[PDB]
Design a protein around this motif. Structure first.
Motif, short mmCIF file in Angstrom:
data_model
loop_
_atom_site.label_atom_id
_atom_site.label_comp_id
_atom_site.label_asym_id
_atom_site.label_seq_id
_atom_site.Cartn_x
_atom_site.Cartn_y
_atom_site.Cartn_z
N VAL A 4 0.54 -1.21 0.03
CA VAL A 4 0.25 -0.21 -0.15
C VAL A 4 0.61 1.35 -0.40
N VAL A 5 1.03 2.07 -1.16
CA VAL A 5 1.51 3.56 -1.10
C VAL A 5 0.63 4.51 -1.49
N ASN A 6 0.69 5.37 -0.39
CA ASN A 6 -0.17 6.34 -0.06
C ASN A 6 0.66 7.65 -0.86
N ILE A 7 1.51 7.29 -1.06
CA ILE A 7 2.13 9.07 -1.44
C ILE A 7 1.73 9.21 -3.79
N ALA A 8 1.06 10.10 -2.90
CA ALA A 8 0.36 11.00 -5.33
C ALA A 8 1.57 11.44 -5.67
N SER A 9 2.57 11.67 -5.11
CA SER A 9 3.71 12.04 -5.67
C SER A 9 4.86 10.94 -6.19
N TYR A 10 4.53 9.46 -6.23
CA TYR A 10 4.96 8.50 -6.09
C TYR A 10 5.84 8.02 -7.95
N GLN A 11 6.85 8.25 -7.49
CA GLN A 11 7.96 7.67 -8.65
C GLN A 11 6.97 6.17 -9.60
N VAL A 12 6.11 5.83 -10.50
CA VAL A 12 5.94 5.08 -10.92
C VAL A 12 6.96 4.39 -11.50
N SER A 13 7.48 3.30 -11.53
CA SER A 13 8.57 2.06 -12.16
C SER A 13 7.80 1.54 -13.84
N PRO A 14 8.10 1.21 -14.65
CA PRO A 14 7.21 0.17 -15.94
C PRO A 14 7.82 -1.25 -14.97
N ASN A 15 6.62 -1.70 -15.30
CA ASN A 15 6.31 -3.34 -14.81
C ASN A 15 5.62 -3.41 -13.01
N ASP A 16 5.13 -1.84 -13.13
CA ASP A 16 4.58 -2.33 -11.79
C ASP A 16 3.71 -2.48 -12.04
N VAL A 17 3.16 -2.79 -10.73
CA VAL A 17 0.91 -3.02 -10.40
C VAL A 17 0.47 -2.25 -9.99
N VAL A 18 -0.54 -1.83 -10.10
CA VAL A 18 -0.91 -1.09 -9.78
C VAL A 18 -2.33 -1.12 -9.32
N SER A 19 -3.11 -0.82 -7.87
CA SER A 19 -4.52 -2.63 -7.70
C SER A 19 -5.34 -2.10 -6.55
N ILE A 20 -6.27 -1.61 -6.89
CA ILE A 20 -7.25 -1.25 -5.39
C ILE A 20 -7.42 -2.44 -4.20
N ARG A 21 -7.18 -1.66 -2.91
CA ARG A 21 -7.02 -2.60 -1.95
C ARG A 21 -8.63 -3.80 -1.77
#
Lengths: 205, 86, 82, 80
Positions: free
Chosen positions: A128-145
RNA sequence: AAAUUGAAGAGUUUGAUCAUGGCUCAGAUUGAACGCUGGCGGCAGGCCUAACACAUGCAAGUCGAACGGUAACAGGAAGAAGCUUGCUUCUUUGCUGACGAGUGGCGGACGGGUGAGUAAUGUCUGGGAAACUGCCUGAUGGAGGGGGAUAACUACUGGAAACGGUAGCUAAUACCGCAUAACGUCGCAAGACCAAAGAGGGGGACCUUCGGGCCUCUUGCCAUCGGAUGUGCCCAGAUGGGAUUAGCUAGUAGGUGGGGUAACGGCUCACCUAGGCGACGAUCCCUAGCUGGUCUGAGAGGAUGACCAGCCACACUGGAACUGAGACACGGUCCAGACUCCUACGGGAGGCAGCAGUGGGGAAUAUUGCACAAUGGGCGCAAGCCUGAUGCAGCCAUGCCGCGUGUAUGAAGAAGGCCUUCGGGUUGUAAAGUACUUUCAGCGGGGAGGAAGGGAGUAAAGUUAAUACCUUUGCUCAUUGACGUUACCCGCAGAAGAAGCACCGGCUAACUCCGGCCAGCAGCCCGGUAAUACGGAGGGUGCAAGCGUUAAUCGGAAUUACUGGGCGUAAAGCGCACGCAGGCGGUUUGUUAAGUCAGAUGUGAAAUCCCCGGGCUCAACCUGGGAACUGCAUCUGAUACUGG
């Protein structure tokens, strides 16, 4: 550290839709988009060079919802990185977590996407990442809890995003409420009505 | 002094000062004897005083009162001064 | 004497020790003779946190340099793991 | 094979000692011009072998007096 | 693979123009201060001024395995019991676990603070020789035999105290001879000379004078030669300004000899010689800690030296030495001075520029906190004790970074406010209403990591005569956290607790209404009765838990121009000439290899800067590796150009 006031005022000042509203209507039916805000909005004065540069920088900032310190640091890192400074800047702006969550379809607006991220309702690689400015890198998987998959906000946002265009660098499944960041977008993939060289000249003067 | 160790160190330091002063005065006297025998031109008395001075000088250099270099300096200087007579 | 010990660098609550060969009279993070490794006590076990050169350490121990207790334990664990 | 210097003798009035001026060519740190710089050294000259004007070869040694720490090696050119 | 990819202008002299030229602005930055405002967290920073004076508490102790000891508390003890006979309660014993005071050993020269002095007695870079070096370490040896004391203690006694005096007794790894004595010192040589110390663990028998000697192990002691480390010394170059400071110097420069130092040396003395420094700035005066670095800059440069790290200097002011391996010694000694305090008036005591803190000065800079749990240090065989170093915590928006102060919908666009050609427009989806959410804060429940060790047991190996003791190595058991209610996670409730500051004539993004060269604004070029410049309101612009003003540095400023400017008239050619020092120098050959160039070696501390990664949920931050440190010295070559 956030803009909480009127949203359509920004798009009226910029003379361009900034997607600050979900999209249940057209902005023309909610406000006078072709008229600047305030008592003297009917007038349009001749903008200077500094005026145009500042207005383009403010348009980009208000699009991405980034304040001036963070945007200045973004330009600093882009000028530090190798290559053209402008596309580096736009890639750094698009890599943000709330921007991706909005583009993924889990947010009707980038404000509610930022609320989804900050409220600890978004996961990155199962963390769980709760930083809006979090730099998302390639191949990352983003999902709803698991706990936030029951919200109707995400459903309405999914529908509103299906009625939008689909970004090429996002592989999203609306059922699992998850998506993958395949790659950083090239200059040709973002909007063509954004002059990065104006921002470069404004910040390099 | 404010610290207990400082007071004991002052006591020990003055005791060692008195001991070292006695030893140093003895050594200086036994060297002045050789120097006076050098002045008088008496080579037999000079060698006698040197033979009396050498052991206590080596001993005080070994006991840490003076350095071995200082003992060697005294011995060499007085030997070279005795050899200038006979 | 010359001793091989740790110099607590890093941030607050996240220490990072540099195995340094230093004259035992200097300060902890002060003047040292040679850095012979490091030690990260909060490593994630995914990465490495013990990269102290044993060649120069043995060379200095052969010259009378003293090994502190933490550095002795670190050498023991490095020899056991490798 | 020993590290040494070379200069001209500018004074020999003192006994067993000479004053050798080592001239060097240094570039100016700012304006880039190559300027002359003089280094005068009190050199130990036993036997009083060196006169004024001799181009002598000197070397560094232990302090021999308050101002003398260099000694003579040989004379190359002799005051003519 | 990467690790120099870097350079913006504008306003203002004029009726207007070009040029010159100054002033001002737009950018970064700070140990900041003030004004308005102020939610949280992480990381850092926090007396720049009075090196002004300091109340109070702490900041350097430790060892009984050196020693005589027993004063305190815990036990063992022989002997006498209140007597409710199994609670035994006090008479004497260092018998031992320990230990106050004392002798002795090591440490107090480290660690911590400040930048007064210091313009070279310092620092940086690069070399060097005439040196010492506790603890750590390698090698070789020795470690025998005696003595006289003395603190404690005892008795008396002087003092208000601080602190003493006398007499007697006792111990040691305290002290002093003797023996021994070499690859050590003196000497060419012969020879002469110089040291020491014990303690602890356990023990098979032999022998005990019942303490034990005798064996073994550990540790300690002395001598010499090395290593490592630290320090002392010397040379060259560099390291502010002033010539409205040009002469300075008598131990001054050198030499011989004596002395002195660990060591060279006018370091010191006697004598002799008459020198030495200086226009490449000596001398004198003012200012100043130096460096890695920091800020700025495209760069060259300019400014600077807070935090962090190295070096130096200082410790109330001036001087001095003692002990010691190391000091001329922050929390040691003696003296003098100023000041403060106690006093029985005779004498005493003290030094926060250590950590908090106080008064003062100032625009301005914090708690009289917790723990030795980790790192390091001192002592100790170890356990362990001490440690205001340090790890943390408290306060401050001081800076950097991150997050929040909600989200979606919401109109004929409500009210009020402002403007209005009175049509309406704008504030404005903004609000209200509706639906949703709960990051952070609040309440409650779980919960890493910083923890390595150390202790007690056993087992193996080594040692040994020994299956004891000791050392190393495995395993077992019970434990070691100031932070701390940790980070992090989980549950509850409810938009609920959380937006301000500056500006809007041009430079410079942002315009209207209302109230008289007055009040006022102003960084540089408005206001004399429809002021986008004053003050208020509406609206807008820019930043945002901050925003502005002030102070300061660089940039822009090519405005000190080396890169990179000029002198006919804008500031600037000496009135003219001769000429020493200095700068430069026609042309050819040979030689040298000083400048120059090439290569290599050593060094250029770590941190910082930059590049690629890693860990903190991201960032700040931390960190691995690399690049860089553009410099200096040495060695080997090149010979075109400059120099000899």
């Amino acid at each position: 550290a956030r803009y909480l006031g009127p949203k359509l005022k920004l798009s009226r000042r910029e003379g361009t839709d900034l997607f600050l509203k979900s999209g249940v209507r057209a902005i023309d039916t909610k406000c006078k988009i072709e008229q600047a805000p305030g008592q003297h909005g009917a007038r349009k004065p001749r903008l200077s060079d500094y005026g145009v540069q500042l207005r383009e920088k403010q348009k980009v900032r208000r699009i991405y919802g980034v304040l001036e310190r963070q945007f200045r640091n973004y330009y600093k890192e882009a000028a530090r990185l190798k290559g053209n400074t402008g596309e580096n800047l736009l890639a750094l702006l698009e890599g943000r977590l709330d921007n991706v969550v909005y583009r993924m379809g889990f947010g009707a607006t980038r404000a509610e996407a930022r609320q989804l991220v900050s409220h600890k309702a978004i996961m990155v690689n199962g963390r769980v990442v709760n930083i809006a400015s979090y730099q998302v890198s390639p191949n990352d998987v983003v999902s709803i809890r698991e706990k936030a998959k029951k919200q109707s906000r995400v459903k309405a946002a999914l529908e509103l995003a299906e009625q939008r265009e689909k970004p090429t660098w996002l592989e999203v499944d609306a059922g699992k409420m998850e998506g993958t960041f395949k790659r950083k977008p090239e200059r040709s993939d973002l909007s063509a009505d954004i002059n990065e060289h104006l921002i470069v000249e404004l910040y390099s003067k | 002094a404010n610290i207990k160790s400082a007071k004991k160190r002052a006591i020990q330091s003055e005791k060692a000062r008195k001991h070292n002063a006695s030893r140093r005065s003895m050594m200086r006297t036994f060297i002045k004897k050789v120097y006076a025998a050098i002045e008088a031109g008496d080579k037999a008395a000079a060698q006698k005083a040197f033979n009396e001075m050498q052991p206590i000088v080596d001993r005080q250099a070994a006991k840490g009162l003076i350095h071995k270099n200082k003992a060697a300096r005294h011995k060499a200087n007085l030997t070279a001064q005795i050899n200038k007579l006979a | 004497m010359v001793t091989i010990r740790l110099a607590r660098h890093g941030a607050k609550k996240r220490p990072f020790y540099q195995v340094v060969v230093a004259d035992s009279r200097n300060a902890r993070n002060g003047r040292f003779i040679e850095r012979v490794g490091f030690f990260n006590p909060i490593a994630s076990e995914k990465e490495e946190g013990t990269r102290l050169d044993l060649d120069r350490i043995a060379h200095w121990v052969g010259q009378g340099a003293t090994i502190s207790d933490r550095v002795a334990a670190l050498i023991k664990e490095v020899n056991k793991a490798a | 094979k020993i590290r040494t210097l070379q200069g001209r003798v500018v004074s020999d009035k003192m006994e067993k000692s000479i004053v050798v001026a080592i001239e060097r060519f240094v570039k100016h740190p700012i304006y880039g011009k190559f300027i002359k710089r003089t280094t005068k050294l009190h050199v130990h000259d036993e036997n009083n072998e060196c006169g004024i004007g001799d181009v002598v070869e000197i070397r560094e040694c232990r302090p021999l007096s308050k101002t003398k720490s260099w000694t003579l090696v040989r004379v190359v050119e002799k005051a003519v």
